[PDB]
Write a structure and sequence with these properties.
This is part of a larger assembly, with nine protein chains of nine kinds. Helix content of chain A is 30%, strand content 22%. With 214 residues, chain A is α+β, with helices and mostly antiparallel strands. In chain A, the strands form two sheets. Chain A has a five-stranded antiparallel β-sheet, covered by helices on one side. Chain A has a four-stranded antiparallel β-sheet with strand order 3-4-5-6. In chain A, a hairpin with a 6-residue loop joins strand 8 (193-199) and strand 9. With 229 residues, chain E is of the alpha+beta class. Chain E has one domain (1-229): Aminohydrolase, N-terminal nucleophile (Ntn) domain (Glutamine Phosphoribosylpyrophosphate, subunit 1, domain 1, 4-Layer Sandwich), CATH 3.60.20.10. Chain E has helices at residues 16-23, 76-97, 103-108, 161-171, 178-192, 219-227; strands at 31-36, 39-45, 61-65, 68-74, 126-134, 137-142, 150-152, 154-157, 202-208, 213-216. Chain H has 239 residues and is of the alpha+beta class. Chain H has one domain: Aminohydrolase, N-terminal nucleophile (Ntn) domain (Glutamine Phosphoribosylpyrophosphate, subunit 1, domain 1), CATH 3.60.20.10. The radius of gyration of chain H is 18 Å and the shape is globular. The termini of chain H are far apart. The chains are: A alpha+beta (214), B alpha+beta (238), C alpha+beta (202), D alpha+beta (206), E alpha+beta (229), F alpha+beta (204), G alpha+beta (228), H alpha+beta (239), I alpha+beta (218). Chains in contact: A-B, A-C, A-E, A-I, B-E, B-G, B-I, C-D, C-E, C-H, D-F, D-H, E-H, G-I. Chains B and G meet through helix 3, strand 8 and helix 4 of B and helix 1 and helix 2 of G. The PDB classes it as hydrolase. Keywords: Proteasome 20S subunit, hydrolase.
Chain lengths: 214, 238, 202, 206, 229, 204, 228, 239, 218
Amino acid sequence: WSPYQDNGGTTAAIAGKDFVILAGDTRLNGDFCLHSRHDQSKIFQLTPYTYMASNGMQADRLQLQQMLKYRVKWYKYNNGGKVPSTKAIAQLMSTMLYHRRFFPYYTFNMVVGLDEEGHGVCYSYDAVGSTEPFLYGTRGSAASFVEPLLDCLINRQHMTSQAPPEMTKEETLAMLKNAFTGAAERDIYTGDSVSFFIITKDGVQQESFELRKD
Amino acid sequence: NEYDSDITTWSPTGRLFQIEYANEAVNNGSATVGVKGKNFVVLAALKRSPVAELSSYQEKVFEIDEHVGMSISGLVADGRVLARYLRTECMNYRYMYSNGMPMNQMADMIGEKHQRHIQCSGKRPFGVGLLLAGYDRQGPHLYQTVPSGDVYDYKATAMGVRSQASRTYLERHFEHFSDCTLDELVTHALKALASATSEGIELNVKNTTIAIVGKDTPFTIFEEESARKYLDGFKMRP
Amino acid sequence: TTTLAFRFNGGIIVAVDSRASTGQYIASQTVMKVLEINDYLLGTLAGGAADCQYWERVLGMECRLWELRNGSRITVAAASKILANITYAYRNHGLSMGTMVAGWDQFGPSLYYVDDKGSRVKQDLFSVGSGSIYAYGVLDTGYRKDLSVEDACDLARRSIFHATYRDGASGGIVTVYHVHEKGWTKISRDDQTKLYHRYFPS
Amino acid sequence: MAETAIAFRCKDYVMVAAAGLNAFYYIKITDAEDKITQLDTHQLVACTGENGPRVNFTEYIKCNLALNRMRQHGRHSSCESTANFMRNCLASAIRSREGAYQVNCLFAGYDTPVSEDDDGVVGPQLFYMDYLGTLQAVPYGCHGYGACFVTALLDRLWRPDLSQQEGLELMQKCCDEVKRRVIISNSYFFVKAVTKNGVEVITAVH
Amino acid sequence: EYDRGVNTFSPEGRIFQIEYAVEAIKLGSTSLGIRTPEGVVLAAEKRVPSTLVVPSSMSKIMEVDSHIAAVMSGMVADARILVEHARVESQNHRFTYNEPMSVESCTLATCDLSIQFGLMSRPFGVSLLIAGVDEKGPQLWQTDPSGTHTRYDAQAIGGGAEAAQSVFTERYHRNMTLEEGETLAVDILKQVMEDQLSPENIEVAVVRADDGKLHMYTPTEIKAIMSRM
Amino acid sequence: SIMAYSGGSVMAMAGKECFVIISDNRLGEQLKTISTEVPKLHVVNDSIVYGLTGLRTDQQTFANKVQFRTEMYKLREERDITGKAFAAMITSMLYEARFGPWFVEPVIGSIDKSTGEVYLCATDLIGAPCEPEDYVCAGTAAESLHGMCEALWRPGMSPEELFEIAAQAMLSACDRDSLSGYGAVAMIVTKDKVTTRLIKGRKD
Amino acid sequence: SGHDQSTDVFSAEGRVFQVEYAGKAVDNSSTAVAACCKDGVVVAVEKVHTSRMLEKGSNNRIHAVDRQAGICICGLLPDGRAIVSRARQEAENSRDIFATPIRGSVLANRVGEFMHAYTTHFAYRPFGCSAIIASYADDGPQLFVSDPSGTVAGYYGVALGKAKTVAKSELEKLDFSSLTCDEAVGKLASILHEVHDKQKDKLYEVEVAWVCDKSDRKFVHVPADMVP
Amino acid sequence: SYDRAITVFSPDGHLFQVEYAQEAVKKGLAAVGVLGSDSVVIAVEKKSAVKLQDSRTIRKIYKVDANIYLAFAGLSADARVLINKAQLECQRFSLNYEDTMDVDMLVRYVAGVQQKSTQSGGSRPFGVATVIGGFNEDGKPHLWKTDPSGMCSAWRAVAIGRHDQTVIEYMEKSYKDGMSRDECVHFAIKSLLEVVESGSRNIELLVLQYKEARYLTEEELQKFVVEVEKEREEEAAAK
Amino acid sequence: ASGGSVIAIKYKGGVLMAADTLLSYGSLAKWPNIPRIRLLGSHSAVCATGSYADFQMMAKQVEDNIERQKMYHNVDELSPSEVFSYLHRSIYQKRCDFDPCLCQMVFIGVRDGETFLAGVDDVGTRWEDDCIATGYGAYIALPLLRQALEKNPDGLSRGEAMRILTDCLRVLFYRECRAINKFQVADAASDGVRISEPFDVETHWEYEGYCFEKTAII
């Protein structure tokens, strides 16, 4: 009996200047079957402005999700009402993944949201608790399929062509739809639907998007 | 009196004098008033009223979970200990059962947490009295706690200094609270709290807190711009 | 990873690459590997990124707490020793962190390699990570103690670069720092492919 | 095993020698790491293990001996004492959660009469100590790959009565034998001698 | 005596040992804080026992973090133990949430130690006046022995604390300059303290709202405040 | 083997109103030799000598313990400990660490100063006392010494006879053992006097 | 004067004064009354309400301990709840460990030994309340009163509180062999109405609870129609 | 363990059990510290030269670590616990941080420990005021005083023990900022002689200089005592 | 002693759960007369594939915690969603002690119209859905149940949702080794859960390709 069970799936985030798009697939796959096609547990709201996408074992993503909520909910009381920033939660996630490093949460997290300026930001973790701020990122099955695509279409590193103007909220979403569609077609453990969360100043706006059923 | 010095000592007339003395710590705390109607609970708390241009915020009302909060009276230290306890426990609960702690069950967890203190030698009773206020499946509950560990499910009440004025008001009107709308409750809650004020002073955003919980309303504390809706458009007339 | 620091008259260079690869696939090409603890202390992370980012951040708490209590900045000797005593207590808890605590205090510039196994070594010159072996190659060629700050950074930037060129796990962006009596300054932040077209123009 | 400590004891001095080699896997960082710590005016310990346990053990001793000199109003404890303290600490460690301090010491000192009343050993004292706590008084000892080359070379040449000068000539041959015969480049040796006068750092030999 | 226990109420509802520890503050040095929008001020009479005392040692005011100062009154010994806790907490917050602690939260974490008496024999005989700058702006809080953390616009604790609250009700207005607050702070200390006021005889220290940093004022800089008066 | 690491052998032998206990002199790590002047005998009082064999660390640790316990006896009880007690005290100390043992095999000689009856004990590492009339041995040469002692040893022998067969035993065994030798230190205890002898053997 | 400050202390006459004192807290409290029938058992208790504004079922003096057993506290209510919280812990240990409903005879004795442990040691004070344990397990219908001393005793009929004396006279007029659980509710509730001082305690209600073959040997508050 | 509350507040806000520990200091033997430009001098009074007390020299000024010395006043027994707690702390420090700990640090430890005792259940307070001198590694000389309350201050010169106020009220008249090794010693003894017996055999004293601690011999001393007791015959002639 | 395989499927205004009445100590079919579906309080049923032992402890501890909270404090009984949250944490807590509840529970329940159906794993992996299975059900029956929910996308009727269980149960019986042809069906509706009397299913074994002469190796 193994206490760890990789429950699969893929999360992606892209940070523009105003917003963050945050995607996590809804396939929760067990051992050689699939349990659900509409698992929303991947992404979790901590505050209005800050979300935590989480891959690997579901049971640990769900423990961590609560554990994190009840250190956010404590922060709320001690710092008189005030909600923690993304940047605070981000270091809190790193601190809380590490306190459990001698029996890790088998969960590859991304804390995502807005900094104090309004500029969108995303942080990634490994099981143990290694914070790296990134601008576009992807953990999970389709890490390897999505993350090179984004690397080409955002950074344009190997192109003579002049870099494209900026990239709006709707283009960055359209890019991620295109990427995940090309990850469902080519990776086995990605599919069903993808829940997108478009965090802006205005409030979150989630729109689930359909993939290949297989 | 040789029987008043320790918690553990019964008097010969069968009174635990140190608890009657923790009950004086509540009656010397600043007045707060709870009232419940069909859907909503209202805590109106008298803060300390600014001396000239000089302010003094003291956390008298606490949120506890989405669906519950506390007014307190007396030793604020002890109130902050109970706030911490109830919060820990409502989380502990919500963690387990993906739903707010029922209010009846919370009433009993503070009843028990008080009693633990009033029997051991080392411990002392809590100087604070609470006004738990919250909403769950069984409608709204207002609870007054007291140091003795007694927990009272009230239709409305006050608690603190000159609170006997507030209860004398609420006794006239408490029956019509099931009928009343959210705005009429708050008026009744303030009219009472106002009966408690010293000599000539009035209620106003800087010297009063209102807090509300009820159907689809998570426990919210109104200070300053939020509260003015109720408090600017208010006066106490006989 | 490749990560090298060295001591000269002018002070201490710290150079690093900017890649965190899990063997074959490259997670990130932008890992900030020089941890900035105090404003007179540079920890460098190599090995388990998790363990460094945590412990070198703890070290930072203990260094600041010392500044409050003792009304005066910690030594680098003591800074490294704090880290050395944390890694020693956890030697058989399977930590992994080849760190270098560089800094300038009362007693001149000081560089300390600090291992997972509680090791603590005063180095004049050092390199950690998969591409160290490559850095040391270049670095032992040009390294004297009497370099100008220009030539020291030139040397370090090359040394990291020539590790990025050979090691697969080392790559990305060749960040260099300098540690002087006035604190530390980030010299450069050059991409390692632009660097190839500087150092080999043909 | 990489880093060779040598020591030998004659009429009126102990000589101690310890590799300079500071190694990270198969990489020479430097040839200038002094491994002979000084515990007292008249007592030093050629410790040779991995840097972590070497430092954390020679510091723990050096402190708990300084702490004794405080509590005992400047009284300089005998060599027999600290040697038996070191070994009692090394032995305690192989039956704790921590595990053994993985350090091979050549503890050396020179007991001088500490007052008028002292009747104990006057003169030099060398002790060989395993990581386990195998204390043993010896005329000459070694630790590390080179040990067994030197140990036999000393069997041959070492007499108990040679000068401070014939000890430099001998310690050079002991050092030069580790240079000739061990692959691991123990290419510079810190040599410290203990005499009646204290510790002196022999720079002549390396 | 030891007739009454420690955790014991009077017939009028106040815990005795607290009611008593509060009367230990009214003997101690006078210390005060002024919450202006430009920044917050703290000033304290040092009440040096003799000439000989190196005045910089017995610091009435203490850095808790970059952005928070404490000033104490009553048992200085006990105050070291509060401020030492507050420092560790301020840094645990920085360690955990990569950000300055609030002032409110640092004052709460200093009354997390002041309640637990029964582990400790007695309350701390000290009132702290914690002042700093965070997202709320410049705040001034007071801890008691009770545990009752109270945000103030301006408060004095200690010897002539009651004589200084008389002056505040007259002179203090919310819209003060940092320059007016320093001038007030030292005007009060002069009227209130027993000795004649010198640059060494008091310490002043401000946290400015602009940079959000603590500056402890040297005797040269405190003479610059006594100049314009 | 952890017992065979540091090497050594010890042997005791009972005659008439005397016993001869005799160690080797070697101290090793495996095959490599450290010292050739390491006798394994300790003297508790006039009338008890015990050798310890096994891991030298523990020989030395467990010795310092036995010395602490037989001194604390000598103060509290106000008398020298007797063989019987001392041997049974040692079993208690060894068995205290049944799980995580001392790698030591105490051979104990002893002689009641009044009666003149000899007592031998060869405790194994977890305090299993073996208390024969004749002789006992332990350490690396143990197989070889049982062979020797069995042939040579007769009942009612006198101190001088006994020593010469205890010495021939210890030597002629340490010839056939890698991890023992460099002579031997015997120790001939009588009610009367205690004769300590350093025997010359091989340099092997 | 020192003979009465703690429960750890016999007087010269040989009685614990602190326990007699806690016993005075029961005899200044709201009157409780109970009656064991063949059918089951009934507990009534007058709750004296301080304020006019209390809800119905505020300061509930009667508590289910297990399915079959409920305590009715008379005395200091908060203390009594600590008893109930214990009685419960015991009643569920009986179900968890020994797989059976706790017998009423045991549950009373388990509660007695609890209330007693607080009459022995100096640190604790004795419990301010009597408990009225009413079970209907396999030992038949059982009524028991654990008083502050820890003195369990089984009753057919029992009265506690400030009216105890007059309320006991009215319990003697009943025939306990004959009465059912349906009569009993009316008579006990009739008693608590008759004895209660109308001038001292204006605001009061009569909380009644039973356990009988009627209620499925399940311990519950009787509906508000049976009460008068 | 017995953790009943000993140190508790009284009606007037006094910690009686600390007021009473300070009374145990006032009765104890006087000790004196004097900071100079380059030198610290800690000078204590001994109980006085009984013919029995061992001719082998016992020092009333305890070494804590190479750099740091301290004289105490109050309960010998308790002081010897502080000193062995400090001595331990200085070596617990050398292990955790390669540095030798500085005076102003160790004082704040010993002070912190003296405070713990005024707030621990089970303990009375240490009946020990403590004059710590010594030099930081950097070169600066430091003098400090820890009183039983736990409250520590750094002084230019100081006294503890019997008639501590009479000495400090005398010292702050005649003290001068920049003082030599000889002026300091002269001054330390001069100040001690205000309260102590006319005799020169009771006063033992220590002169700390950077990396150089030396107790004065009773030969070196009686030069400075004749030199000072002739100057207290010049200040008796004026008045 | 292990449980076989549970299937459950939401219909209009309820849930069906179905489970073989068989515990199996390894290969051996030990007990064919075990009621594997348990009722948790007045609203919810539960049932577990895996260690009947570790399920008997978890279903005991939960059914206690419900009828306590209800009887002690004067509250509403826990909603299925809550009961199931309590079961989920209770199970996760046990995998975090390395002392796991080594059993896949299915859990059904209905408060009002509020119709709740969830699985949970040994490790705490929890999932709501419109059809659950555990054990072989997951590999066999689930495919068929999901097909019957895709085809009736408005929702199944109780007659349709019973026929599709009976189809899956027939197929579990054919293809799962440690099963028997004696099942119970829990039915959560508005009134509460009803467990059916054990029933068998009609089984077809007389295919012309299953005859002796065709299947013969020689």
